Scaffold this motif. Sequence first.
Motif, PDB file in Angstrom:
ATOM      1  N   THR A  23      59.818  28.342 -11.324  1.00 55.15           N
ATOM      2  CA  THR A  23      60.605  29.428 -11.892  1.00 55.15           C
ATOM      3  C   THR A  23      62.073  29.030 -11.915  1.00 55.15           C
ATOM      4  OG1 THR A  23      60.831  30.463  -9.720  1.00 55.15           O
ATOM      5  CG2 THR A  23      59.065  31.293 -11.119  1.00 55.15           C
ATOM      6  N   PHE A  24      62.855  29.666 -12.777  1.00 55.77           N
ATOM      7  CA  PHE A  24      64.290  29.630 -12.546  1.00 55.77           C
ATOM      8  C   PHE A  24      64.849  31.012 -12.840  1.00 55.77           C
ATOM      9  CE2 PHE A  24      63.997  27.964 -17.028  1.00 55.77           C
ATOM     10  CZ  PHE A  24      64.855  28.820 -17.719  1.00 55.77           C
ATOM     11  N   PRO A  25      65.914  31.412 -12.150  1.00 56.84           N
ATOM     12  CA  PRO A  25      66.432  32.767 -12.323  1.00 56.84           C
ATOM     13  C   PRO A  25      67.299  32.886 -13.559  1.00 56.84           C
ATOM     14  CG  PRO A  25      67.685  31.638 -10.636  1.00 56.84           C
ATOM     15  CD  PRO A  25      66.574  30.699 -11.038  1.00 56.84           C
ATOM     16  N   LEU A  26      67.218  34.063 -14.168  1.00 52.53           N
ATOM     17  CA  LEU A  26      68.000  34.421 -15.345  1.00 52.53           C
ATOM     18  C   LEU A  26      69.188  35.229 -14.849  1.00 52.53           C
ATOM     19  CD1 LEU A  26      64.962  35.473 -17.538  1.00 52.53           C
ATOM     20  CD2 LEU A  26      66.182  33.257 -17.620  1.00 52.53           C
ATOM     21  N   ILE A  27      70.344  34.581 -14.750  1.00 55.80           N
ATOM     22  CA  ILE A  27      71.527  35.181 -14.143  1.00 55.80           C
ATOM     23  C   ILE A  27      72.430  35.731 -15.235  1.00 55.80           C
ATOM     24  CG2 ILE A  27      73.589  34.741 -12.759  1.00 55.80           C
ATOM     25  CD1 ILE A  27      71.982  32.443 -11.422  1.00 55.80           C
ATOM     26  N   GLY A  28      72.642  37.044 -15.223  1.00 55.50           N
ATOM     27  CA  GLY A  28      73.560  37.651 -16.164  1.00 55.50           C
ATOM     28  C   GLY A  28      75.005  37.325 -15.848  1.00 55.50           C
ATOM     29  N   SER A  29      75.876  37.556 -16.835  1.00 57.18           N
ATOM     30  CA  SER A  29      77.308  37.359 -16.620  1.00 57.18           C
ATOM     31  C   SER A  29      77.867  38.314 -15.572  1.00 57.18           C
ATOM     32  CB  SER A  29      78.076  37.503 -17.937  1.00 57.18           C
ATOM     33  OG  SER A  29      77.723  36.475 -18.848  1.00 57.18           O
ATOM     34  N   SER A  30      77.155  39.399 -15.276  1.00 54.02           N
ATOM     35  CA  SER A  30      77.492  40.293 -14.179  1.00 54.02           C
ATOM     36  C   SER A  30      77.268  39.681 -12.798  1.00 54.02           C
ATOM     37  CB  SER A  30      76.652  41.562 -14.300  1.00 54.02           C
ATOM     38  OG  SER A  30      75.278  41.225 -14.440  1.00 54.02           O
ATOM     39  N   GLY A  31      76.659  38.501 -12.705  1.00 52.73           N
ATOM     40  CA  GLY A  31      76.263  37.929 -11.431  1.00 52.73           C
ATOM     41  C   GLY A  31      74.908  38.385 -10.941  1.00 52.73           C
ATOM     42  N   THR A  32      74.227  39.218 -11.722  1.00 54.89           N
ATOM     43  CA  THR A  32      72.930  39.799 -11.416  1.00 54.89           C
ATOM     44  C   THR A  32      71.803  38.890 -11.884  1.00 54.89           C
ATOM     45  OG1 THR A  32      73.896  42.002 -11.768  1.00 54.89           O
ATOM     46  CG2 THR A  32      71.479  41.838 -11.768  1.00 54.89           C
ATOM     47  N   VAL A  33      70.729  38.839 -11.106  1.00 51.52           N
ATOM     48  CA  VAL A  33      69.498  38.184 -11.535  1.00 51.52           C
ATOM     49  C   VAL A  33      68.671  39.222 -12.288  1.00 51.52           C
ATOM     50  CG1 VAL A  33      67.448  36.918 -10.840  1.00 51.52           C
ATOM     51  CG2 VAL A  33      69.626  36.590  -9.588  1.00 51.52           C
ATOM     52  N   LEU A  34      68.496  39.032 -13.597  1.00 51.60           N
ATOM     53  CA  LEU A  34      67.790  40.014 -14.411  1.00 51.60           C
ATOM     54  C   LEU A  34      66.287  39.776 -14.484  1.00 51.60           C
ATOM     55  CD1 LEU A  34      70.319  40.020 -17.444  1.00 51.60           C
ATOM     56  CD2 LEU A  34      70.253  41.621 -15.526  1.00 51.60           C
ATOM     57  N   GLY A  35      65.837  38.556 -14.229  1.00 52.67           N
ATOM     58  CA  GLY A  35      64.425  38.228 -14.329  1.00 52.67           C
ATOM     59  C   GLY A  35      64.256  36.759 -14.012  1.00 52.67           C
ATOM     60  N   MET A  36      63.036  36.243 -14.162  1.00 49.83           N
ATOM     61  CA  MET A  36      62.779  34.821 -13.931  1.00 49.83           C
ATOM     62  C   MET A  36      62.032  34.257 -15.129  1.00 49.83           C
ATOM     63  SD  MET A  36      63.710  34.322 -10.524  1.00 49.83           S
ATOM     64  CE  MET A  36      63.108  32.655 -10.405  1.00 49.83           C
ATOM     65  N   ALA A  37      62.367  33.027 -15.506  1.00 51.67           N
ATOM     66  CA  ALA A  37      61.481  32.254 -16.362  1.00 51.67           C
ATOM     67  C   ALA A  37      60.374  31.675 -15.493  1.00 51.67           C
ATOM     68  CB  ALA A  37      62.249  31.134 -17.078  1.00 51.67           C
ATOM     69  N   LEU A  38      59.129  31.803 -15.935  1.00 54.93           N
ATOM     70  CA  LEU A  38      57.978  31.360 -15.151  1.00 54.93           C
ATOM     71  C   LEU A  38      57.109  30.433 -15.985  1.00 54.93           C
ATOM     72  CD1 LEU A  38      55.859  31.532 -12.774  1.00 54.93           C
ATOM     73  CD2 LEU A  38      54.968  33.605 -13.932  1.00 54.93           C
ATOM     74  N   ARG A  39      56.781  29.264 -15.436  1.00 55.93           N
ATOM     75  CA  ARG A  39      55.759  28.396 -16.021  1.00 55.93           C
ATOM     76  C   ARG A  39      54.383  28.893 -15.580  1.00 55.93           C
ATOM     77  NH1 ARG A  39      56.063  22.042 -17.416  1.00 55.93           N
ATOM     78  NH2 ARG A  39      53.814  21.639 -17.631  1.00 55.93           N
ATOM     79  N   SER A  40      53.571  29.370 -16.536  1.00 56.29           N
ATOM     80  CA  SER A  40      52.348  30.093 -16.186  1.00 56.29           C
ATOM     81  C   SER A  40      51.312  29.181 -15.553  1.00 56.29           C
ATOM     82  CB  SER A  40      51.732  30.718 -17.440  1.00 56.29           C
ATOM     83  OG  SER A  40      52.717  31.278 -18.258  1.00 56.29           O
ATOM     84  N   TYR A  73      58.898  35.314 -19.439  1.00 55.84           N
ATOM     85  CA  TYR A  73      60.112  35.907 -18.889  1.00 55.84           C
ATOM     86  C   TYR A  73      59.706  37.170 -18.140  1.00 55.84           C
ATOM     87  CZ  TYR A  73      62.328  32.374 -21.704  1.00 55.84           C
ATOM     88  OH  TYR A  73      62.759  31.145 -22.189  1.00 55.84           O
ATOM     89  N   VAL A  74      59.759  37.114 -16.815  1.00 56.39           N
ATOM     90  CA  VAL A  74      59.246  38.181 -15.955  1.00 56.39           C
ATOM     91  C   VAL A  74      60.417  38.973 -15.386  1.00 56.39           C
ATOM     92  CG1 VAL A  74      57.851  38.749 -13.911  1.00 56.39           C
ATOM     93  CG2 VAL A  74      57.249  36.791 -15.375  1.00 56.39           C
ATOM     94  N   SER A  75      60.295  40.303 -15.399  1.00 57.54           N
ATOM     95  CA  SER A  75      61.336  41.145 -14.831  1.00 57.54           C
ATOM     96  C   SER A  75      60.705  42.404 -14.237  1.00 57.54           C
ATOM     97  CB  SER A  75      62.399  41.504 -15.885  1.00 57.54           C
ATOM     98  OG  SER A  75      61.828  42.216 -16.995  1.00 57.54           O
ATOM     99  N   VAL A  76      61.459  43.052 -13.352  1.00 54.80           N
ATOM    100  CA  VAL A  76      61.003  44.285 -12.715  1.00 54.80           C
ATOM    101  C   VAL A  76      60.893  45.389 -13.756  1.00 54.80           C
ATOM    102  CG1 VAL A  76      61.735  46.159 -11.198  1.00 54.80           C
ATOM    103  CG2 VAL A  76      61.880  43.722 -10.407  1.00 54.80           C
ATOM    104  N   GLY A  77      59.749  46.051 -13.790  1.00 51.67           N
ATOM    105  CA  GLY A  77      59.644  47.350 -14.449  1.00 51.67           C
ATOM    106  C   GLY A  77      60.008  48.491 -13.494  1.00 51.67           C
ATOM    107  N   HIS A  78      59.259  48.655 -12.402  1.00 49.02           N
ATOM    108  CA  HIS A  78      59.407  49.813 -11.515  1.00 49.02           C
ATOM    109  C   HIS A  78      58.579  49.584 -10.255  1.00 49.02           C
ATOM    110  CE1 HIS A  78      60.113  53.956 -10.307  1.00 49.02           C
ATOM    111  NE2 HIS A  78      58.880  54.367 -10.546  1.00 49.02           N
ATOM    112  N   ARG A  79      59.142  49.959  -9.102  1.00 51.16           N
ATOM    113  CA  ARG A  79      58.407  50.002  -7.831  1.00 51.16           C
ATOM    114  C   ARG A  79      57.834  48.632  -7.461  1.00 51.16           C
ATOM    115  NH1 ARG A  79      54.703  55.496  -7.285  1.00 51.16           N
ATOM    116  NH2 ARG A  79      54.615  54.968  -5.022  1.00 51.16           N
ATOM    117  N   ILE A  80      58.600  47.577  -7.753  1.00 56.77           N
ATOM    118  CA  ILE A  80      58.223  46.232  -7.354  1.00 56.77           C
ATOM    119  C   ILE A  80      59.496  45.403  -7.312  1.00 56.77           C
ATOM    120  CG2 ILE A  80      57.770  45.319  -9.699  1.00 56.77           C
ATOM    121  CD1 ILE A  80      55.188  44.048  -8.385  1.00 56.77           C
TER     122      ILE A  80
END
Length: 245
Positions: A176-193, A202-209
């Motif tokens: 994986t590698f993290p998708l870092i926004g210009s805000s300094g936030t990690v928005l999701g990860m690129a994942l090799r399946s 491109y995996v990201s949080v929906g809710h309650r995880i």
Amino acid sequence: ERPPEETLSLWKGEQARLKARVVDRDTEAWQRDPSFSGLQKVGGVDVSFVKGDSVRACASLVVLSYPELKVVYEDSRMVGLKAPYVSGFLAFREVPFLVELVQRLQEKEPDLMPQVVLVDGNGVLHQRGFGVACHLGVLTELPCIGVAKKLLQVDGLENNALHKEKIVLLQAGGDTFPLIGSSGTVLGMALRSHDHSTKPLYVSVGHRISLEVAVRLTHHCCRFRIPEPIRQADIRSREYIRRTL
Ligand SMILES: [Mn+2]
Ligand SMILES: [Mn+2]
Ligand SMILES: [Mn+2]
Ligand SMILES: [Mn+2]
């Protein structure tokens, strides 16, 4: 083929209001478990449409057993979509129909309610941090994971040469590698399946995880590149379209 700006403004306001309900940390006991013990039912949703018609569509909800990934529930039904596709407003096309499938499951087989839903599309990796996977999560209160098949270019994220260099560095299934926004936030990860795929999810949080649990579970659902719950919903909804028409 695009709603007027005044409509999109109303939708942005709704997304901002509902975002206050997103929980981006683990809230289920199985999520913190090294082998996801306690997880028995994983959901997947998708909508397929017809060639030459962006209104008639087939929405599908499947529930798979975990870790066997066998389909134990399928609901594929023909629906008439109203809103067109606009990047950043996917939920306003698909999410009312997905919510209805979850409600139909509660009425029909409540004991097969999924413990988490993999959604074809982003969660917080989104122009306003509130993609279709967050939107389904907040309206159903189910844990949800956003899985997109290409990169939504938001908050400085871009599929440029630098991004493709990082993809080359993904070398084995699970990397994986993290998708870092210009805000300094990690928005999701690129994942090799898997070992024999190179285009990442491109995996990201929906809710309650949490993101790290969302990535790991997505990886455990990948027999092929597309995680098996989404893959079955995608295959069955397209198959359903073909047979009836
Ligand atoms: Mn088990
Ligand atoms: Mn889809
Ligand atoms: Mn397709
Ligand atoms: Mn699909």
